[PDB]
Each structure stands twice: as structure tokens, then as C-alpha cells.
């Protein structure tokens, strides 16, 4: 019929109010014979003596709840952890009132911990809510404290999963560093201006100083920081026009402890209505058993719902519907410019003054024009020629009086075993070069043509370390960022569509065989080949993957593996020497080859009628107009003219 309560308080006025609230808890609960006994302790500079003293005293008093309510700790660690672990050894619930570290939401470590203040991941949730206001989808992340940086990043990922959007860049490091200008320069080249900050005040001041040196506070920059980032000397170096958030009544400990004590009293009276009400023993000495109602009492406290604001513990045991305010740095005087509701944002009448120009939202998503195009050595579409004297291309004229528009291309001399690193600017022309020139003329941008370090289209292959599949070739370069837009005879398949985007294909053809002067794949002598009929294909090309997909041609996959050639030129030369007997390859290329060389002959079957298109990056505004331009080129006689240039002609 008595309830013992242990508390840790130093300020005597707050302890007096705590005792007053404990006394007033027995007011609205009637004249029942339940009693509330109070126990309080003060601070000591150490953390082991405080831990052992509090544990032994509140164990001997046989208390039910424990509180921590001291913001102004000279120690910057903010550690109630010994109290939590020791009172969790007996599954006796503990209540936090000040600490806001996101580590305390994890209940695998802190078995019996609850608090009435939200960790900083809620600020990330509010930021995601703000993203719903101005229609922003590209962000840059930088979190220093790796103890909670992973938690903040995971919360942001959970937020973004609903829209299925991914951050442009994330960063974690060791707090206390200063040379962070390299990462700032890395982020400068990107398109997004959304900068997310969550770090210590030392790191905040350091990065503010570095960014002020680098001049990244101009117009178009999106700034958004948390509460910890604008206090102390960090506020001193804060660039004007920044947006800050506020924890309402997060420091007036009076009403905070009052609400906590009221909740505790109501929960205790609610539990008193139940059966099997045991008590914690003097577990200080020789009591190794847990409280058999430990989880029971914890779950009773978890279901604690109230209406007198509303206090409600989530599955993480944290308070929801917290009110946040929005502050702006107007000439380095904080001004309230907005508030955050339980799930809504309500801006006030105060103007939104930004570091740059307008008060309207600056679209901090930059644009791109200089495109780094990658292409491959294709015999009828992409020609290779060394320059005449120095970076110059001989202006040869076609038989129709049309000058040949060449382009200065930079690529290696030969393969790595032959030519390790020998790249010279050369002259490239053909079909795709003309197509790219037309694309550049039609639209408004610039470009830079360069070659691919190897001659393979690109395949997903396990790297010998980490047992992880990796790509190479054109897709390997494009995904590495060194390329921007693949323009080449790109074979459209299912693997590529998942990783990168396409437009309407500009080619229409299938697959066939080059022979020298069988009837297609239906030849029984090719169903079970021998050393005589030699059919080969290009190593690490899309055709090999296509044939590997259908296991019904496993023997063919087991035969072509012994004679895969690097390039189509090698296979054509070898079959011209009659060292080969068949060559599975595209139709248009082999038709142009048969026009060039009269001895080249094709077979009959025309299967797998796919197309060639333009590989792209992920969802970008360089897609809709690109596909519209491709369609507009297909509709009129432009394709016929390009065929007159290269495809239609015969030799």
C-alpha cells in the first residue's frame, strides 16, 4: 500500500516542486490506502560512485521508477547510461527527461528505458515533411557522429522509401576534423543544393568556416540544419539566411517533470487494479532473480495513453506529436518564421529571407550541358583515323559533294597488353557521329567525344574480391560517372533496362550468320558441333549473354567459349582467312560487310528482332526530348538520307 519513487535532482526548487507533485498525485485518486514515498539524490562529479549509490539506494527503497532531469551537465557526454543499465538488470522501468540521443531508442541494449522527448531522427522526419512542401528530390547528406549518423541515415532512408527516391550523396567521418574542403568541392560539382547538417558544434563551426572560405553561400543554395547546430560558437560562424528548428518547452523542467509525474501516478493507479503485484527485492545483495512482472509492468507502461498535451509512447517508447518551431537567420538575429504541427507545417506571416536573392524557393537543382559521350569502334558506324598533322582531319568530300563531318576523338592506341597507355586525338566518322551532330545541332548543349578503354560492350562479372558481381565496358564506364550518355549500336535487353534508361531504338534488325563463298541455327551439325564447323561470337558481348539465357543452347555456349574474339574485325579477318566457318552477328553490319567483300554471304534465318537505341543515365530531363527527337528523325526522310550516306550504299 506504499509506492517508493527514486529521483535524481540537484536544484532545490525543482525537488520541492517534485515533492509537491508527488503529494498532489493523491488528490484526484480518492482516499485509497495507496501511498507514494519520495526519494531524491543530488549530483556527484563521478559516474561510477553516482551509479552504485543510486542503484543501491533505490534498490533498498524498492522503488518502481527512476528519472533523469538535468540539462546543464558540465560533462558533455550526457550519460544516464549506468542508471538505465542497472535498473534494467531487474527490468524496473526508467524514465528519461532530458537526454535526446538517438542511441536510447534502441531497446536491444537499453531493455527498460523510456523517455518523453524525441531523438533527432524526428528532425529528419520533419525535414522529409518539408520536402513535401517545395517539391525537392535531390539532397546532399553529411553526418559526423557515427554513433547516431547511421541511425539518422536509416531514418532518412525510411522516409525516402515512400517516394522511392535516393539521396545524391551521403557522408560520414570522424567528428573534430577540419580539412573538409575536398568534400565541399566534390559536392559543388553536383546539381543539388540541398545540404543536410547534423553534427557537433565544433564540426558545424569548422564546416561553416570552410564553406565561407569557399564561397558556397550564394543564391540558389538550400540550407537546412538541426537544433544542435546553431548554439555555442557554431552560431557565431553561421552564414546569414539559414533556417533553424526549435524544441518548444524542451528546457522548462518544471512543467516537464509535472507532466511526467502525473503520467507516472496515473500508470501506477492503473496497474494497481491488476493482480500479481510483486515488488523488487533488495537486489543489492544476493538477489540474482529478475522481476517476474518486469516485462508486464513495462508493457503496461507502453500502453499508457492519455489526454491531459497528449503523451503517448510509440513502439520506440518516445513522445509523438511534438511541436517544432522554424527560425531564420535575419542579420544574425533569430526570427520565428514557421511552426511544425503533429504532422503538418504552418508557416507564419514572417518573410522567408534567403542568403541569395528572392524570398521564393530557389530551385537548387543545377543543370548540365557539357556531355561526356562514350562510343565504341563500330566498323560501319564509327570509323577511326589518325590525324593528318596535329589534331586535324582531312576534309574529304563524298561522291555527292557533301563534306565528311568528322570529330576529334580521344582513345587508346590498342588493347592494354599491346598498348598499355597510348591515347591520341583521332578522327571519327560514320553513322552515329552524324546522328550525334544532328542531335547537338537540334538542341542547346555541348559535348566531348571520347572512346572506351576496351572494346567490349559490357557484362556483369564477379570481381575476385568480396564475391560481388560488377559490370564493365560501356555500362561499367557509364555507371562510374566517367560517361554521361552512351550513343552506339546498343543492344536493348532486360539487364540493361533495369540499370539504365533507353529511348526509342533507332535501328531495326535481328541476328544472322556470316559465311564465306547450314541454314541458320536449325543446322543439326551446329546443334552438336565439332572441330570442323567453327562458329564464333564476340567475347563479353550481348549475344553471348543472350545465348547463355536459354540453357537449351548450352553446348553452343560450351563451344563458342573456346573461340570468342575481341572485336568483329578479328572475326571477319579470321573467316576471310577461312580460319572460321560461321559468325553469329547483327544483320546490318554483316550486310554492309557483304557489300564491301563479295565473298561474304549471310544465311536465311532472321530471329530475335530487336533494335539499337541510345543508352542514358537514370531518370533525367535528357530523356523526354531525346526520345521525341529520335521519333521526329524517324518520321521524316532523315533516316533515308543517313542510309544514303552509309547504309544504302553498296561496294
Amino acid at each position: 500500500k506504499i509506492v517508493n519513487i527514486g529521483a535524481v535532482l540537484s536544484t532545490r526548487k525543482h525537488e520541492q516542486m517534485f515533492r509537491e507533485a508527488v503529494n498532489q498525485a493523491n488528490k484526484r485518486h480518492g482516499s485509497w490506502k495507496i501511498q507514494l514515498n519520495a526519494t531524491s539524490v543530488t549530483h556527484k562529479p563521478n559516474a561510477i560512485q553516482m551509479a552504485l549509490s543510486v542503484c543501491e539506494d533505490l534498490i533498498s527503497s524498492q522503488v518502481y521508477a527512476i528519472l533523469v532531469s538535468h540539462p546543464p551537465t558540465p560533462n558533455d557526454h550526457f550519460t544516464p547510461t549506468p542508471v538505465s543499465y542497472t535498473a534494467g538488470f531487474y527490468r524496473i522501468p526508467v524514465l528519461g527527461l532530458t537526454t535526446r540521443m538517438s542511441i536510447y531508442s534502441d531497446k536491444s541494449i537499453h531493455l527498460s528505458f523510456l523517455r518523453t522527448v524525441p531523438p533527432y531522427s524526428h528532425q529528419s522526419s520533419v525535414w522529409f515533411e518539408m520536402m513535401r512542401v517545395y517539391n525537392w528530390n535531390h539532397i546532399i547528406l553529411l553526418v559526423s557522429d557515427d554513433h547516431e549518423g547511421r541511425a539518422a541515415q536509416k531514418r532518412l532512408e525510411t522516409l525516402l522509401e515512400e517516394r522511392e527516391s535516393k539521396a545524391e550523396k551521403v557522408l560520414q567521418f570522424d567528428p573534430g576534423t577540419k580539412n573538409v574542403t575536398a568534400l565541399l568541392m566534390e559536392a559543388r560539382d553536383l546539381e543539388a543544393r540541398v545540404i543536410i547538417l547534423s553534427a557537433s558544434e565544433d564540426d558545424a563551426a569548422t564546416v561553416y568556416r570552410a564553406a565561407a572560405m569557399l564561397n558556397m553561400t550564394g543564391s540558389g543554395y538550400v540550407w537546412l540544419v538541426g537544433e544542435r547546430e546553431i548554439s555555442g560558437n557554431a552560431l557565431r560562424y553561421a552564414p546569414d539566411g539559414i533556417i533553424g528548428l526549435q524544441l518548444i518547452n524542451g528546457k522548462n523542467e518544471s512543467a516537464h517533470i509535472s507532466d511526467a509525474v502525473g503520467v507516472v501516478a496515473q500508470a501506477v493507479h492503473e496497474l494497481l487494479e491488476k493482480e500479481n503485484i510483486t515488488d523488487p527485492p533488495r537486489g543489492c545483495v544476493g538477489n540474482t532473480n529478475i522481476w517476474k512482472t518486469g516485462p508486464l509492468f513495462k508493457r503496461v507502461l507502453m500502453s499508457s495513453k492519455y489526454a491531459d498535451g497528449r503523451v503517448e509512447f510509440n513502439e520506440d517508447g518516445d513522445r509523438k506529436f511534438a511541436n517544432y518551431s522554424i527560425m531564420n537567420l535575419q542579420n544574425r538575429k533569430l526570427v520565428q518564421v514557421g511552426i511544425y504541427n503533429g504532422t503538418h507545417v504552418i508557416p507564419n506571416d514572417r518573410k522567408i529571407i534567403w542568403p541569395g536573392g528572392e524570398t521564393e524557393k530557389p530551385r537548387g537543382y543545377q543543370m548540365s550541358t557539357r556531355l561526356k559521350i562514350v562510343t565504341i569502334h563500330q566498323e560501319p558506324f564509327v570509323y577511326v583515323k589518325p590525324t593528318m598533322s596535329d589534331g586535324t582531319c582531312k576534309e574529304e568530300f563524298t561522291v555527292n559533294g557533301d563534306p565528311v563531318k568528322k570529330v576529334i576523338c580521344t582513345g587508346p592506341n590498342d588493347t592494354s597488353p599491346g598498348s598499355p597507355r597510348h591515347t591520341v586525338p583521332q578522327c571519327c566518322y560514320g553513322f552515329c557521329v552524324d546522328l550525334l551532330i544532328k542531335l547537338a545541332r537540334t538542341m542547346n548543349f555541348t559535348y566531348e567525344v571520347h572512346l572506351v578503354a576496351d572494346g567490349k560492350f559490357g557484362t556483369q562479372e564477379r570481381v575476385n574480391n568480396s564475391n560481388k558481381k560488377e559490370w564493365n565496358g560501356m555500362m561499367g564506364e557509364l555507371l562510374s560517372g566517367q560517361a554521361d550518355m552512351i550513343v552506339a549500336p546498343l543492344t536493348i535487353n532486360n539487364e540493361r533496362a533495369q540499370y539504365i534508361e533507353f529511348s526509342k531504338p533507332f535501328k531495326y534488325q535481328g541476328l544472322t550468320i556470316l559465311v564465306k563463298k547450314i541454314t541458320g541455327i536449325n543446322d543439326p551439325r551446329l546443334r552438336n558441333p565439332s572441330d570442323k564447323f567453327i562458329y564464333a561470337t564476340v567475347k563479353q558481348s550481348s549475344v553471348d549473354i543472350y545465348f547463355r539465357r536459354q540453357v537449351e543452347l548450352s553446348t553452343m555456349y560450351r563451344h563458342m567459349e573456346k573461340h570468342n574474339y575481341e572485336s568483329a574485325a578479328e572475326a571477319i579477318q579470321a573467316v576471310r582467312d577461312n580460319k572460321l566457318h560461321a559468325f553469329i552477328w547483327d544483320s546490318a553490319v554483316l550486310e554492309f560487310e557483304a557489300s564491301q567483300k563479295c565473298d561474304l554471304v549471310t544465311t536465311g534465318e532472321l530471329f530475335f528482332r530487336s533494335g539499337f537505341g541510345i543508352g542514358m543515365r537514370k531518370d533525367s530531363p535528357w530523356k523526354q526530348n531525346v526520345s521525341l527527337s529520335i521519333l521526329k528523325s524517324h518520321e521524316n526522310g532523315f533516316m533515308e538520307d543517313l542510309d544514303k550516306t552509309w547504309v544504302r550504299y553498296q561496294e
Partner: antibody, heavy 119, light 114 residues
Framework: QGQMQQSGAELVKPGASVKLSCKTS????????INWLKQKPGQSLEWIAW????????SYNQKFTDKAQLTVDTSSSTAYMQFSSLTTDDSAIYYC???????????????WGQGTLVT | DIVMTQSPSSLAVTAGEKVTMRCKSSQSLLWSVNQNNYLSWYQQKQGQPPKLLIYGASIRESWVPDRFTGSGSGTDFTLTISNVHAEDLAVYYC???????????FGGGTKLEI
């Protein structure tokens, strides 16, 4: 109406330290700015420092950056200025004032303490 | 520190007359983005804390009678009393309120005599 009450008169030996208190009431203590000003008798007030209670942001005068320190107590809504290494030049009247801000735009010091003389 | 120049240093007038007190700042107190002057006029009487008289170099406080009139912009400012009363006898100071122009400084002051 907001009220700011300062501590009583102090007689301090030269080179010693004094810590003045300024209790505030009648307004949002957490979301306002408080300034300490030094006013010698017959002289205009000299701005010493300002502090924001909501973020603990501190900014001192360069003449007093190494001389004065500011602290606040949210439970009591009382401002504090600790003046150390006191010299005869510090024989003056110190005042604490609350900033007046309208529409988010500061318009001047609207509230004042009664003043404290340090000898 | 922006140098605040107040003129005249002191003056004596009979009741009912009109007076004019000028304030000059070494730098423009007007911020171009918002076009507002960070100047504040004050009334300081003997033995009392100074009372905020006019802010923004043109706006009177609610308690300030219409007889007070503050003018001037940029670097030069003026405080004018159309109908001088005996109660107005005080030393009036103009002080800048520009946050980007820290620290806050005061002019020499003008003593009003009757």
C-alpha cells in the same frame, strides 16, 4: 507586462570578481534576447554582451570578451553576468534589458531593469 | 564602430517653441534589401532608465506623442519636436540597431533645456 529585476549594490575589492543576477518575468524567457549594458554615472551606456536563452548563443564586446561571462537559468528565468578582475574603471551602473522585436524585426530595447551599482 | 554624430550638443528653448536635433552616422544605416534605417531615438531623463522614443528614424512609439517627429535617412537623421513641453527636458540619444554593423554605438547626445 514583463519585469526584469537586478541584484543589489556591490562593494568589490579591486581585482576580485562579481556575479550579477537579473530575474526576468512576464514574457517568453526562452525566445527573447537579453543585453547587459555598462553605464558609468553621467555617461552613456556601453553595450557589453548579448545572449540568446533558447540556444545559449553568446556574444561579448571585444573590450569585455575576456572580462565578462554570461549564464542563464531556465528554471528561474534569471540572467547572470559575472564580472571578473574588477578594477576601479568598473565602478559604474550595470543594466539588463530585454529586446523588443516586432514582426520578427527588432525595434529596440523595450524593457529595462532597475539598475545595479558596483563599487 | 559606426560613429554617431549628434547635433546640437545641447539647447535651451521656451515652452511652446519648435526644436530640431540631428543625428549623423559614419555609415549608411539603411539596408538596401529591405530599405529600412537601423536608427533608434531615445529619451533619457535623470535617474531613470532610457525610454525608447523613435525607432527606424521615423516611427514613434505608442507612448510617444505626435509632437515628436523623427526624420532623416541613410547617414543623416533628425529628431524634431513641433511643440516643446517642459516634461520633454531630457538627454536624447540616437543609437544604431544594424546587426551586421556590430557593436551597438551611441552618439554624443543632446541635452534639452527649458
Amino acid at each position: 507586462q514583463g519585469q526584469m529585476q537586478q541584484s543589489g549594490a556591490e562593494l568589490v575589492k579591486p581585482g576580485a570578481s562579481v556575479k550579477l543576477s537579473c530575474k526576468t518575468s512576464g514574457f517568453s524567457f526562452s525566445t527573447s534576447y537579453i543585453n547587459w549594458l555598462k553605464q558609468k554615472p553621467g555617461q552613456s551606456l556601453e553595450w557589453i554582451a548579448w545572449i540568446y536563452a533558447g540556444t545559449d548563443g553568446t556574444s561579448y564586446n571585444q573590450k569585455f570578451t575576456d572580462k565578462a561571462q554570461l549564464t542563464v537559468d531556465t528554471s528561474s528565468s534569471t540572467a547572470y553576468m559575472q564580472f571578473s578582475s574588477l578594477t576601479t574603471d568598473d565602478s559604474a551602473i550595470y543594466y539588463c534589458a530585454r529586446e523588443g522585436i516586432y514582426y520578427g524585426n527588432y525595434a529596440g530595447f523595450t524593457y529595462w531593469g532597475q539598475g545595479t551599482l558596483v563599487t | 564602430d559606426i560613429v554617431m554624430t549628434q547635433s546640437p550638443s545641447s539647447l535651451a528653448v521656451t515652452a511652446g517653441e519648435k526644436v530640431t536635433m540631428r543625428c549623423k552616422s559614419s555609415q549608411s544605416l539603411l539596408w538596401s534589401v529591405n530599405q529600412n534605417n537601423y536608427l533608434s531615438w531615445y529619451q533619457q531623463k535623470q535617474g531613470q532608465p532610457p525610454k525608447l522614443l523613435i525607432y527606424g528614424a521615423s516611427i514613434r512609439e505608442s507612448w510617444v506623442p505626435d509632437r515628436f517627429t523623427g526624420s532623416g535617412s541613410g547617414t543623416d537623421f533628425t529628431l524634431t519636436i513641433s511643440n516643446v513641453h517642459a516634461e520633454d527636458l531630457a538627454v536624447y540619444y540616437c543609437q544604431h540597431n544594424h546587426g551586421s554593423f556590430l557593436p551597438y554605438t551611441f552618439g554624443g547626445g543632446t541635452k534639452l533645456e527649458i
